[PDB]
Design an enzyme around this catalytic site. Sequence first.
Site, PDB file in Angstrom:
ATOM      1  N   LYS A 148       1.724  25.057 -48.728  1.00  0.00           N
ATOM      2  CA  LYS A 148       0.407  25.106 -49.254  1.00  0.00           C
ATOM      3  C   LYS A 148      -0.278  26.102 -48.185  1.00  0.00           C
ATOM      4  O   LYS A 148      -1.364  26.704 -48.842  1.00  0.00           O
ATOM      5  CB  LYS A 148       0.138  23.781 -49.185  1.00  0.00           C
ATOM      6  CG  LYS A 148      -0.130  22.985 -47.861  1.00  0.00           C
ATOM      7  CD  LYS A 148      -0.203  21.654 -47.536  1.00  0.00           C
ATOM      8  CE  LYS A 148      -0.093  21.167 -46.053  1.00  0.00           C
ATOM      9  NZ  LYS A 148       0.972  22.020 -45.389  1.00  0.00           N
ATOM     10  N   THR A 149      -0.372  26.026 -47.152  1.00  0.00           N
ATOM     11  CA  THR A 149      -1.110  26.738 -46.077  1.00  0.00           C
ATOM     12  C   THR A 149      -0.997  28.362 -46.092  1.00  0.00           C
ATOM     13  O   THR A 149      -2.058  28.902 -46.211  1.00  0.00           O
ATOM     14  CB  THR A 149      -0.631  26.484 -44.637  1.00  0.00           C
ATOM     15  OG1 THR A 149      -1.281  25.286 -44.211  1.00  0.00           O
ATOM     16  CG2 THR A 149      -1.373  27.514 -43.619  1.00  0.00           C
ATOM     17  N   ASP A 196      -7.073  23.951 -41.762  1.00  0.00           N
ATOM     18  CA  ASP A 196      -5.609  23.632 -42.039  1.00  0.00           C
ATOM     19  C   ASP A 196      -5.014  22.352 -41.270  1.00  0.00           C
ATOM     20  O   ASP A 196      -5.472  22.264 -40.154  1.00  0.00           O
ATOM     21  CB  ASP A 196      -4.847  25.107 -41.514  1.00  0.00           C
ATOM     22  CG  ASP A 196      -3.815  25.613 -42.305  1.00  0.00           C
ATOM     23  OD1 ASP A 196      -3.302  26.592 -41.908  1.00  0.00           O
ATOM     24  OD2 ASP A 196      -3.642  24.927 -43.520  1.00  0.00           O
ATOM     25  N   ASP A 197      -4.087  21.850 -41.950  1.00  0.00           N
ATOM     26  CA  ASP A 197      -3.320  20.711 -41.296  1.00  0.00           C
ATOM     27  C   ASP A 197      -4.306  19.689 -40.896  1.00  0.00           C
ATOM     28  O   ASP A 197      -4.428  19.451 -39.863  1.00  0.00           O
ATOM     29  CB  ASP A 197      -2.380  21.004 -40.089  1.00  0.00           C
ATOM     30  CG  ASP A 197      -1.095  21.875 -40.773  1.00  0.00           C
ATOM     31  OD1 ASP A 197      -0.755  21.602 -42.001  1.00  0.00           O
ATOM     32  OD2 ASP A 197      -0.303  22.380 -39.930  1.00  0.00           O
ATOM     33  N   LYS A 243     -20.289  18.447 -47.198  1.00  0.00           N
ATOM     34  CA  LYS A 243     -21.727  18.194 -47.495  1.00  0.00           C
ATOM     35  C   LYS A 243     -22.748  19.091 -46.943  1.00  0.00           C
ATOM     36  O   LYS A 243     -23.941  19.513 -47.901  1.00  0.00           O
ATOM     37  CB  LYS A 243     -22.141  16.656 -46.936  1.00  0.00           C
ATOM     38  CG  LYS A 243     -21.700  15.661 -47.973  1.00  0.00           C
ATOM     39  CD  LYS A 243     -22.956  14.854 -48.642  1.00  0.00           C
ATOM     40  CE  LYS A 243     -22.449  14.207 -49.956  1.00  0.00           C
ATOM     41  NZ  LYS A 243     -23.569  13.486 -50.327  1.00  0.00           N
ATOM     42  N   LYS A 275       8.995  25.902 -48.218  1.00  0.00           N
ATOM     43  CA  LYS A 275       9.103  26.105 -46.731  1.00  0.00           C
ATOM     44  C   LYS A 275      10.475  25.782 -46.221  1.00  0.00           C
ATOM     45  O   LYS A 275      11.477  26.358 -45.749  1.00  0.00           O
ATOM     46  CB  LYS A 275       8.012  25.601 -45.791  1.00  0.00           C
ATOM     47  CG  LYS A 275       7.913  25.755 -44.499  1.00  0.00           C
ATOM     48  CD  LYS A 275       6.795  26.160 -43.816  1.00  0.00           C
ATOM     49  CE  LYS A 275       7.086  27.056 -42.657  1.00  0.00           C
ATOM     50  NZ  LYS A 275       5.875  27.893 -42.473  1.00  0.00           N
TER      51      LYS A 275
HETATM   52  N1  LIG Z   1       2.956  28.694 -53.601  1.00  0.00           N
HETATM   53  C1  LIG Z   1       3.053  28.878 -52.298  1.00  0.00           C
HETATM   54  N2  LIG Z   1       2.029  28.099 -51.576  1.00  0.00           N
HETATM   55  C2  LIG Z   1       2.145  28.055 -50.244  1.00  0.00           C
HETATM   56  N3  LIG Z   1       2.998  28.840 -49.603  1.00  0.00           N
HETATM   57  C3  LIG Z   1       4.136  29.502 -50.230  1.00  0.00           C
HETATM   58  C4  LIG Z   1       3.835  29.627 -51.728  1.00  0.00           C
HETATM   59  N4  LIG Z   1       5.156  30.316 -52.100  1.00  0.00           N
HETATM   60  C5  LIG Z   1       5.669  30.746 -50.896  1.00  0.00           C
HETATM   61  N5  LIG Z   1       5.327  30.210 -49.977  1.00  0.00           N
HETATM   62  C6  LIG Z   1       5.649  30.477 -48.372  1.00  0.00           C
HETATM   63  O1  LIG Z   1       5.686  29.205 -47.724  1.00  0.00           O
HETATM   64  C7  LIG Z   1       5.276  29.274 -46.298  1.00  0.00           C
HETATM   65  C8  LIG Z   1       4.145  28.384 -45.674  1.00  0.00           C
HETATM   66  O2  LIG Z   1       4.576  27.070 -45.774  1.00  0.00           O
HETATM   67  P1  LIG Z   1       3.467  25.887 -45.187  1.00  0.00           P
HETATM   68  O3  LIG Z   1       2.037  26.708 -45.547  1.00  0.00           O
HETATM   69  O4  LIG Z   1       3.607  25.717 -43.666  1.00  0.00           O
HETATM   70  O5  LIG Z   1       3.404  24.622 -45.966  1.00  0.00           O
HETATM   71  P2  LIG Z   1       2.900  23.106 -45.599  1.00  0.00           P
HETATM   72  O6  LIG Z   1       1.551  23.158 -45.051  1.00  0.00           O
HETATM   73  O7  LIG Z   1       3.405  22.474 -46.992  1.00  0.00           O
HETATM   74  O8  LIG Z   1       3.882  22.683 -44.433  1.00  0.00           O
HETATM   75  C9  LIG Z   1       4.956  30.862 -46.136  1.00  0.00           C
HETATM   76  O9  LIG Z   1       5.778  31.283 -45.298  1.00  0.00           O
HETATM   77  C10 LIG Z   1       4.864  31.442 -47.305  1.00  0.00           C
HETATM   78  O10 LIG Z   1       5.531  32.893 -47.591  1.00  0.00           O
END
Ligand SMILES: Nc1ncnc2c1ncn2[C@@H]1O[C@H](COP(=O)(O)OP(=O)(O)O)[C@@H](O)[C@H]1O
Lengths: 482, 473
Positions: A294-295, A348-349, A376, A453
């Site tokens: 997601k990040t 983030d997080d 807000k 990830k």
């Molecule tokens: N659709 C997507 N959304 C978010 N990250 C992605 C996506 N597709 C691939 N990635 C890959 O995922 C990795 C990041 O995971 P991360 O943001 O740490 O997830 P989480 O916050 O769920 O732990 C990156 O290294 C990026 O290259």
Amino acid sequence: KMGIGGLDKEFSDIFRRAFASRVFPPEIVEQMGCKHVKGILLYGPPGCGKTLLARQIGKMLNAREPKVVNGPEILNKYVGESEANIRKLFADAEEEQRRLGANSGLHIIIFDEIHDTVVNQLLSKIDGVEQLNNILVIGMTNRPDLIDEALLRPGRLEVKMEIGLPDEKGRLQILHIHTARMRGHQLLSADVDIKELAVETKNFSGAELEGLVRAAQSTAMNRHIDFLASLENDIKPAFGTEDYASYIMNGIIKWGDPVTRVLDDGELLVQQTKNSDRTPLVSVLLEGPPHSGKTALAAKIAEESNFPFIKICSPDKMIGFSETAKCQAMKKIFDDAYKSQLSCVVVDDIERLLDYVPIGPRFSNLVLQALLVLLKKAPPQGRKLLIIGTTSRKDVLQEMEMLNAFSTTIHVPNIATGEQLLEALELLGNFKDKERTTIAQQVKGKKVWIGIKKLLMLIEMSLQMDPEYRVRKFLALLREEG
Amino acid sequence: GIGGLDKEFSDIFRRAFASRVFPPEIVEQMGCKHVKGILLYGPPGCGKTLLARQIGKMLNAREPKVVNGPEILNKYVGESEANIRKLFADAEEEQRRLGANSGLHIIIFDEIHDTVVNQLLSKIDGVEQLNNILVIGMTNRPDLIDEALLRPGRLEVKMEIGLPDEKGRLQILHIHTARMRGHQLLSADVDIKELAVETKNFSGAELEGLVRAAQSTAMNRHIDFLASLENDIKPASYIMNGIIKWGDPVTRVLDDGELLVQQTKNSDRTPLVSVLLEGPPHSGKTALAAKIAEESNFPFIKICSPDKMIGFSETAKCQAMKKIFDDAYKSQLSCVVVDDIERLLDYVPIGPRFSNLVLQALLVLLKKAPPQGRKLLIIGTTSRKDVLQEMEMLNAFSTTIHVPNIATGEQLLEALELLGNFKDKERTTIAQQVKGKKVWIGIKKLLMLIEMSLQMDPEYRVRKFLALLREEG
Ligand SMILES: Nc1ncnc2c1ncn2[C@@H]1O[C@H](COP(=O)(O)OP(=O)(O)O)[C@@H](O)[C@H]1O
């Protein structure tokens, strides 16, 4: 009429009003019947080149004041004493004025980076008991809120000026003087264009411009022993107004149909921002199983957006900070977001950001408040912001009223389909064209619940082992993870 | 020149000065010792200082005026205390040298513990004499100052001033303006009466200041009017959207709010009324409260924002509440709008976590009323009426107003209409998808979803709208 890039209407009004009341000669003021203004104060975002404007304004005002500069410490020397110094520089000007008081002596004193006795001391000298007019003082400071209320009221500091966002036209003016001076001499770079440099940079402070140019001169020097200017743009700042390569270590592979949909939805959101007069602030979040991806996605959306000011927020910077300190840094980013007209910021997080812990649960109230108010909280009129928060756990966040705040919620789900997993494998290009086929044979009749990830980490894990082994191991690993 | 304060000022002036003025047997016939001091407490911006300088000037050909620095006590070692004693000392010395008649010294302390308390008290009264001088103290708040000084004797008379009278304000603006009048140059657009009606709060000082900014402004131009421009700029943000009136309830709340205002301003019997808005977020109640404040046209209306208070320590939040509220007291009447009532508390449903100290400060003040001759209205917005009642604070508030966002389809379209975002056709389809059904979305998310729909192509806007509203249910 030189030199200050941009800031011509505001500057003009302020200037004419402070100086003109003095300027009309000489009966007009009595005709006016008005006492001369005591001081003018300017508060600006950092680097807005407040200082240069002030030196210039002072110079313009008098043949020679001749300028008085106050050290930042101001109050250095504890024993008596310093306080007396803050009183004392005023003292020379008041003395000259008493010796010649009526007309026509003006002294300009400026305090850069403006409690107990000193508060009072400055206040007494600037206004009252008797007279103390025929001098003006300008104070330059990064934040309005920090400074004392008493000074602000009309009288001692009647006029307060807030610096405008740096003009494109202005940017062209500051760059134009240095470039022009270079123009005047025969040597110049044909490729570099003034208008082009201006269009390329929005955020930069004055200071920044001389800096960029200086770096270009140095690289040019290097060539002798775009071009140099380009190299400077590429490195030199350090502007302070975004490294995405640290948040997309692993490429946003179009592993699954969901990935493209999450990004297009990001596109939809930025497009929502673009105007959004009805709604000033855009709040969005991504919710995913841990190892969700997601990040990176949030960072990618931010790169995609290319809004004029983007600053990444990191859990990692917050580590080991006092809960109050954690609130404070976060606050500072918030105001920084204010400066851009169209802007994007990343949280983030947030479960991690909050220090939220599963047992208890135990969490940080102050941090939560800064976070809660912000969504807000409204950016200054004109300028707008979009907030992206990545949260591992949806329900707790919903539970603290955090979910309610967000304009939009996006949930990133790990693909449950083997073929999509395969598609992911193909984009990453880790396995051989044989292996992809084998994985394809195995996945059918099977359901996969794994994060990108996590998937990529898993893949990488299977790959190190030997070739006969990689297929079997990856399958087994998938089975265990399932 | 002293704006307003002609009746009060006159009586006070007469009582301190007249008793001195009658010459000379009259005082003995009265057989009353001369008053020691007069003290004035005013709202900030009340021009206390000018009135005092003027009063002192008026009182004697030359006192000639004594000014006391704010620090007062500067110099720690012995020492400062001695200074506070010492300025008194010159006056007492002159009086002993000529004591009987007729020497008067005026000393004024601006922004008025241990030894200094006693020191001022001893010199002002006793042991023997110390009369033939007067001292005036100027301060923003009455409550801060010491009780002992107040009793008749050392500080027999205490004066409280209600800003500047409208007629008087007209007098000060009138003198500077008149002087301007006398010379040929003048601004035709500016009117004396108009300036007076426009400003209620300002100190005399403020007036010379305003004139000054305007003169400076004429000064801006050559190489209502200027004053109006200053009102326009010199010192909306909260509700950039403005308020639509989708349902009779939405309108009805702004009207009820107007009624609360009317009651507060109009009726003597209750100094205070509390206006409460009940909604579940993302409700627009915060907005409704702002609206309520605007129609009232109270002399002083201030809306307080948590973000302004954000990150503050318990004490700081409490101090801010105290400050705003002290500011409200000083005006004859006011509307104060309180926002994010849950947030000031920092209540979190998990826990529970909340700050009691702040809760007591708000709760105590709410019941509390300003001193007589003044009235105020407090409006608060609450997310969670139940939790608030559970505090039992809700009982304290005078009135309860509840709107559950938007609940019927009619209310929905009426809003889309007042906002004017969708085409006649689109709204005709939306109504066909909502009329009769039950909806439940606050005004702001609506303002949001609408924008989230205007982003889709001209044909995907409606469908996207119904999808979003389908989620925010
Ligand atoms: N659709 C997507 N959304 C978010 N990250 C992605 C996506 N597709 C691939 N990635 C890959 O995922 C990795 C990041 O995971 P991360 O943001 O740490 O997830 P989480 O916050 O769920 O732990 C990156 O290294 C990026 O290259």
